[PDB]
Structures are given as C-alpha cells and as structure tokens.
C-alpha cells in the first residue's frame, strides 16, 4: 500500500509459560541452605512479543533500545531481593544468562542473547539473608520494568 494511516512500533507484550506469570520456587531448601549453599536453580523465560523484538542485526534488548530492570524490595545485600510470607532467613537472587546478578531497581546490562530466540532467560535461587531459618511458605511479586528508548 503506497497510501495508508500511521503505523507505529507497539510496546512488547510479556508472555510466560504460566498464565499467572508465576515461577514455582519449590519447598524451602533448608538442607541445601544449612550446608552453606543456595537453593536449587529455577529457570524462567520471558518472551517479549508483538514489538518486532528481533531485527536482522540483533534485538531490542542487546542493542539497548529497551532497558530492563527488576523492581522489588532489597534484601540483605544489593544483590538480593526480599520475600514475603511466613518463612524467615531467606532472600531471592536473580541472575541472567552470563551470571550477572540483578539488583533491585538497577538496570540489567545489555548482553547478546543465546539460541537466537525471542526470549529473555533468568535464573532464580533462594539464598540466606543472615537471619535464622524458619521454614515456611514464601512469596514475592517482582516488577519487571521495560523502559523504551
């Protein structure tokens, strides 16, 4: 069509496996934590759709056309997030595919993506927060903020 109305790039819609946009963390990893380790790793994939995320040379994330940030309550260190619920002695850690740890409210570094997929991949794990462990149920809502250039 030579002649037509304005067509603009839409912002990305976020798609996950789970309809609630939830990652199951599993039972509090008490044994693992007491041996001085973190809990087991939990993969989560965010797909960013409808924004033509991929282009011939790269993608919006790796090119710094969008900036992403995890928003939440800082835990014990800048590298940790706070958790709600009855459990005690625990924080969450989020890492990217090169092992860069997310800090609450700080922009993730632009890195090139793997399996040239349309997806952002993150890893979470439960870590100690220095307080005494009381096993129990935990939860968190994390903001995932996409700032558009």
């Amino acid at each position: 069509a030579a002649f037509h109305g304005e067509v603009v790039r839409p912002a990305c819609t976020l798609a996950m496996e789970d309809a609630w946009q939830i990652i199951d963390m599993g039972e509090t990893p008490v044994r693992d934590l007491q041996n001085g380790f973190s809990g087991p790793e939990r993969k989560f994939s965010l797909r960013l759709r409808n924004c033509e995320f991929n282009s011939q040379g790269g993608n919006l994330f790796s090119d710094s056309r969008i900036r992403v940030t995890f928003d939440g309550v800082r835990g014990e260190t800048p590298d940790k997030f706070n958790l709600s619920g009855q459990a005690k002695g625990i924080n969450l850690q989020i890492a990217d595919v090169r092992g860069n740890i997310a800090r609450a409210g700080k922009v993730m570094p632009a890195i090139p993506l793997t399996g040239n997929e349309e997806a952002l991949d993150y890893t979470l794990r439960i870590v100690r927060n220095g307080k005494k462990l009381e096993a129990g149920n935990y939860f968190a809502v994390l903001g995932f903020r996409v700032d558009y250039e």
Binding site: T13, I22, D63, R65, L124, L142
Partner: protein, 216 residues
C-alpha cells in the same frame, strides 16, 4: 499480560487530550492495569499538567481498552518553543495465586511522552533530525541538537550497517543541547535515530575537518 500500542507518545499541544490503546493479551485471566505520568526526572506526578485516566482499570481476559491523557490549564506554563519530556507508565497487577512458594512477575512499561507545543507542531514524516551536527573531539563526538525536539540517537558508525547494528550506548539529546559521546573516528559517519513511530532511520554525514553535517 497488559500491553501498550506504542513505544513513545507525542502529545500534540494543540489538543487537550489523546488516548493510548492497551490490551490484555492473556486470554485466560483478568489483569489490572495502572497508568500514571512521571516528569522529566522520572518523579511521579498526579495533579498536572498532564494526567492519565483511569489510573487503574480491570481488563478481562483478552480485553482491549484505553488510557486517556489530558492537560490541565497549568500546561500553558511549559515552554511553547521546545518539547517537554514526561514518562507514561503502564503497570499490570496480575491476579493473586494463593500458591505456596512462588515468585510472580508484573510487567511495567515505561515510555517517553513528548509534549510538543502547538508552535512547533510537525507534519507526518517530517525529519528535523537531519539538523544534527557532529563535532570530532578527544575520544568521540560532541553531537549538537539545535532543534526544538528531543532526539534519541541509537547508532553511529562508518557505514549504514554499522549505524544500525554496531554497539552504541543509546543517548537522548534534549532540545537545543549538545552531548559528548565516546566513539571511534569515522571517515563518513552514519547516524541512526528513533523517530516518532518507533522506526530507526539512518542519516549519512560528511565532515569538513572536525565538523560533520548531513549530506544535502
């Protein structure tokens, strides 16, 4: 789940309001969407001079809706000869799962919102970005934006392909301002920028000594 229909918004100062379409792309679950404005410092604002309504709404699975931006009389206090920058924010509230041991993710979308006064109103596809000037300096370029508009620069290389695909730290030039950018020297610089529609055109520059301007 909740998405916005654009990656930047231009508010035409000759009108009193505009709308942005939003959508719940989750076809299974209702999501709430909160909408608010922030000022150029990304500090929140609520009484003016631009407001977003409704500030919260419920979207049924698959539903389409909108958010409206309007101006208050205090809008007249902004400069009339240059753009002002705000941010529009759209943050979903996912439905609560009462599931044990879960992490729930909530998208927030933050876009630039350019208030463009009536006196500097533009036509469809108008290009002012070709008025940029590059100046070579130690370690890079001082880029001058003499225009009344914000200009977002996302590429700078020695060919078109380098402008579009080369590594470059995105930088936004305020109206009538200049900024220094770390860069290799390029014989014939190409510069990529984002336009009002979210497209990424490229401009070809020619240098006379340290000063570079767009090929007429």
């Amino acid at each position: 789940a909740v998405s916005l229909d654009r990656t930047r918004a231009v508010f035409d100062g000759s009108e009193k309001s505009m709308t942005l379409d939003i959508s719940n792309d989750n076809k299974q679950l209702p999501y709430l969407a909160q909408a608010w404005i922030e000022n150029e410092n990304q500090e929140k604002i609520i009484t003016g001079p631009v407001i977003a309504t409704p500030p919260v709404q419920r979207l049924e699975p698959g539903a389409k809706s909108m958010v409206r931006l309007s101006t208050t009389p205090d809008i007249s206090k902004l400069p009339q000869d240059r753009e002002s920058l705000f941010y529009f924010n759209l943050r979903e509230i996912p439905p609560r799962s009462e599931k044990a041991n879960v992490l729930q993710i909530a998208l927030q979308t933050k876009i630039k919102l350019f208030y463009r006064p009536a006196a500097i109103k533009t036509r469809p596809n108008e290009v002012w970005q070709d008025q940029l000037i590059l100046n070579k300096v130690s370690g890079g370029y001082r880029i001058e934006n003499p225009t009344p508009y914000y200009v977002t620069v996302i590429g700078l290389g020695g060919s078109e392909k380098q402008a579009e695909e080369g590594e470059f730290e995105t930088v936004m030039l305020s109206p009538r301002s200049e900024q220094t950018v770390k860069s290799a020297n390029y014989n014939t610089p190409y510069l990529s920028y984002i336009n009002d529609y979210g497209g990424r055109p490229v401009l070809s520059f020619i240098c006379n000594g340290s000063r570079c301007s767009v090929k007429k």
